[PDB]
Amino acid sequence: MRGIVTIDGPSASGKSSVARRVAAALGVPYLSSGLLYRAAAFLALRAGVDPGDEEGLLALLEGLGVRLLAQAEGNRVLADGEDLTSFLHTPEVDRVVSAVARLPGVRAWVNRRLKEVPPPFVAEGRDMGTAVFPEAAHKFYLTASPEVRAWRRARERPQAYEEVLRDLLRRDSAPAPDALVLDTGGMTLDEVVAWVLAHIRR
Ligand SMILES: Nc1ccn([C@@H]2O[C@H](COP(=O)(O)OP(=O)(O)O)[C@@H](O)[C@H]2O)c(=O)n1
């Protein structure tokens, strides 16, 4: 459209699929901020560094020129020209990404890469409408119960719901004050896409 749409929410709340669909429907890119955090975690694991060493990790990230490629069928992340995406939506990354996402310098690094992109676009994450694009014209926040979130994530991991839920509960972004809050347990994600688009297009 003109400017920026943010779609935030907890893990497996549906924000990823909804941002991709909304963006395609508006003919603009979507940016998955979490794919950059997943990349930072995956690189730190493979590099064999201590992720508590922020300086070394940033040198690694800054050095391999890690970049987000927004494609309409899905974002990709390249490191030194290698597409890392197929290694990022895995149990090992899910389990360690919080260690790196809490590092202030990692968040600054992800946010710099996001702020590089010219609007319009749809950006999805935890704090897109609060920390990174508080000026966004259209903000949405998708809530979901832990059960609904676990059930969804289990669909895409070797683990079953019982295990995913336990994991999610131990793992457990407030909404922006101006975000439309929608509970994806009560609306289907197809209904959510429609509803978010009706709002943006008003
Ligand atoms: N704006 C963001 C996005 C992701 N993250 C971290 O990156 C991880 C992966 O995000 P993701 O969007 O790819 O996956 P989900 O856990 O959100 O389903 C999150 O679980 C966050 O721990 C973050 O801290 N802030």
UniProtKB/Swiss-Prot annotation:
Q: Which reaction does it catalyse?
A: CMP + ATP = CDP + ADP; dCMP + ATP = dCDP + ADP
Q: Name one GO molecular function term.
A: CMP kinase activity
What Gene3D superfamilies does its record include?
P-loop containing nucleotide triphosphate hydrolases
Chief localization: cytoplasm
Give UniProt keywords alphabetically.
ATP-binding, Cytoplasm, Kinase, Nucleotide-binding, Transferase
Please state the span of the N-terminal signal peptide per the UniProt entry: none
Name one cellular component (GO) term: cytoplasm
* Compartments it resides in: Cytoplasm
Where does the chain bind ATP? Answer: G9, P10, S11, A12, S13, G14, K15, S16, S17
The organism sits in which domain of life?
Bacteria
Under InterPro entries, the record lists: Cytidylate_kin, Cytidylate_kinase_dom, P-loop_NTPase
Q: Name one GO biological process term.
A: pyrimidine nucleotide metabolic process
The entry assigns this protein to a family as follows: Belongs to the cytidylate kinase family. Type 1 subfamily.
Q: Which HAMAP family match?
A: Cytidyl_kinase_type1
Indicate what this protein is called per its UniProt record.
Cytidylate kinase
Which source organism does the UniProt entry give? Thermus thermophilus (strain ATCC 27634 / DSM 579 / HB8)
Q: Could you tell me the gene encoding this protein?
A: cmk
